[PDB]
Design a protein around this ligand. Structure first.
Ligand SMILES: Nc1nc2c(ncn2[C@@H]2O[C@H](COP(=O)(O)OP(=O)(O)NP(=O)(O)O)[C@@H](O)[C@H]2O)c(=O)[nH]1
Ligand SMILES: [Mg+2]
Length: 166
């Protein structure tokens, strides 16, 4: 079956791992559990296509940039995750996108901008700001909550469909 290598990137603590574990294990992880590097493999059916999602969960910590680069290089699509209550993680998005472009030697790779933690009332990044940024990149913007599962399959499935169109 087709394998899609998806890479989840973003600042530390935005919920990269919680998003992935919701998709894979249907559970919200409320624990503090920083990632170094983790891989998940799941057989799914997306629009009648049997395929294998190979999800590379990366570290937000700068100490693992070289490790992150190595895994970014193999990815076919990228979830760029920020948290809607963390303005700095939204600002960091530009830096993550540029590194993706660097290691993939491409100006446009399949990518989804993911505004996570939308269950929180304490929003500091307006949806309009993130939509505008996504529009400038040419990529879709999807708001998610790993807690309520809102948007989770949307984010991953939209990325897979973007790889089909690439
Ligand atoms: N309310 C809420 N909390 C969330 C959400 N996603 C993650 N969190 C919380 O935010 C914290 C960080 O989550 P985690 O998935 O570990 O983030 P990460 O991006 O993988 N961090 P790292 O870069 O170290 O691997 C955890 O306490 C988790 O429960 C969400 O959608 N809503
Ligand atoms: Mg993590």
């Amino acid at each position: 079956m087709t394998e899609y290598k998806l890479v989840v990137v973003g600042a530390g603590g935005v919920g990269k791992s919680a998003l992935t574990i919701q998709l894979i294990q249907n559970h919200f992880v409320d624990e503090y559990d920083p990632t170094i590097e983790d891989s998940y493999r799941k057989q799914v059916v997306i629009d009648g296509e049997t395929c294998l999602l190979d999800i590379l969960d990366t570290a937000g910590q700068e100490e693992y940039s070289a490790m992150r680069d190595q895994y970014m290089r193999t990815g076919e699509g990228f979830l760029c995750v920020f948290a809607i209550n963390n303005t700095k993680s939204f600002e960091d998005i530009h830096q993550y996108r540029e590194q993706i472009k660097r290691v993939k030697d491409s100006d446009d790779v399949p990518m989804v901008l993911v505004g996570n933690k939308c269950d929180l009332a304490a929003r500091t990044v307006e949806s309009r700001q993130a939509q505008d940024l996504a529009r400038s990149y040419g990529i879709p913007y999807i708001e998610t909550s790993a807690k309520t599962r809102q948007g989770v399959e949307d984010a991953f499935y939209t990325l897979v469909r973007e790889i089909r169109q690439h």
